Structure formats: structure tokens, C-alpha cells
């Protein structure tokens, strides 16, 4: 049970460091940690200014295909499209393979559904031109309400999200199995399972946690569905828990 789930989950990790005071040394160490005795993580996720040093570290350890994700409009999810789009354009220029943008969830909570569509769509158009995948963080722990989680997910998908993602990791409540079920049901109901991935992020701590999230995916979409284009774990400490479950 835990061995099989843990080796799947490890391969799906966006191994992340997003601190206010990160350093090159910490990002280098993270890149080294992404190359494990049982597999490489799918990606690393770091702030944009670290993309060049991460790319060279990944090449120099012989893992050039570990993707580099970053974040924009982050963590706030403010509703200023010009800023979100400028930050997304800058992340592309820094060399990102993927951008995880924060949806304007407080504007949605205040009744504005259109700004979330326009913000995601603008960011998607910049990313798509550069062959960069766009994940959209809806911040389920602050939306709280099931109807709002569904609505933010639907808007994001309609606007072109390549993934929908639970959380920034910067608020009090991040991924939960409840939130994951709701978001994956939207992917199912909208018929976009082929084109939209899911990423639970923040507070995914243990191999046991990861096994729960994969069980939801397998139930909704079949055991074949999850893969790097369709599923990621936004996590850090989880990696050591997965390796421990695997005997490392």
C-alpha cells in the first residue's frame, strides 16, 4: 500500500522552497534532493530569481528534465491584472517551465467572477506562447465555502488553466482531502480530465497523506490518470517521508 503509493507520489512532487529569505545554497540543495535513489521528482518550485542557478544545478547533476516551476501574483491573489501579468511575463523571462499564479479569490468572494477569468486568461496567453504550463492556485483554505471552491475552479478552467491547485502554502489552511475531492469533481464534471491537472499543495506532510490524495484521483479518473501532466504534490518535507516509506 504505502510503498506503491509513495513511489508514485515522489515522481509527482513539485519539490518546493518559497521562503522570504531563500538563498542559492538552499535552492542548490533542493535540486540535489530532487534526484533521489528511487526516482526524480517531477519538478522543483522556487522564486523566479533562482531559476538560472537551479537550471544549471539540474543540468550539472544529469537531471535536465526535472521541470522548474515558479509562482506569480503570489501569495496574495490580488486583483490587479497588470501586476499579475507583468509578474508572469517576468517569470517566463527568468526561464520558468511552469507558472503557478494565484487566482483573485478575494475579488471572487466579493462577487466579481469576471476578474478571475480575465486574469487567468491573460496569464495563460503569455505562458502558452512560451510553451509554459499555467497552474492556478484558488486558495481553498481562504475561500472555505464549497460553492466558491467549485466556482473558482470552474472560472480557472474556462480561462485556460492547465492545472488547478489548492493553495499557496502561505495561509493557515492549505490542502485537505475534502478540498481535493471538490476540485477534482469539477475537473470531472467539466470533462477536462485530459487537459487539466490537479495539485494539492501545502500541509501534505506524510506518505499516508499522499496515499489519500492519490486514492481520490484513482477513484474519480482511474488508476491510469495521474502522471506528471495531470497531478502534482506541492510539498517539501513530504519527500523525506516518502523515501522513509520506501526504505531510504
Author numbering: 3 to 250
Manuscript excerpt for this entry:
2-Deoxy-d-ribose-5-phosphate aldolase (DERA) is used in organic synthesis for the enantioselective reaction between acetaldehyde and a broad range of other aldehydes as acceptor molecules. In 2001 the catalytic mechanism was resolved for DERA from Escherichia coli (DERAEC) by Heine et al.: the active K167 forms a Schiff base with the donor molecule, while K201 functions to reduce the pKa of K167 and, together with D102, participates in a proton-relay system critical for efficient catalysis. However, practical application of DERA in organic synthesis is limited by its poor stability towards high acetaldehyde concentrations. Hence, a monomeric variant of the enzyme (K58E-Y96W) was used that has virtually identical biochemical properties.
To determine the structure of these reaction product(s) and to identify the exact target site(s) within the protein, X-ray structures of DERA from E. coli before and after acetaldehyde incubation as well as after thermal treatment have been determined. Crystals were obtained for all three states under the same conditions, yielding datasets with resolutions ranging from 1.1 Å (native enzyme) to 1.5 Å (after heating). All three structures turned out to be very similar, with obvious alterations limited to the catalytic center. Interestingly, the native enzyme features electron density for a six-atom molecule with about 70% occupancy, which is attached to the active lysine residue. The covalent structure of this ligand is consistent with an aldol product formed by two acetaldehyde molecules (compound 2 in Fig. 4), which forms a hemiaminal (a hydrated Schiff base) with the lysine amino group. Given that this type of linkage is expected from the well-established catalytic mechanism of DERA, our findings may be rationalized by the presence of trace amounts of aldehydes in bacterial lysates or crystallization solutions. Importantly, this appears to be a reaction intermediate reflecting the intrinsic aldolase activity of the protein.
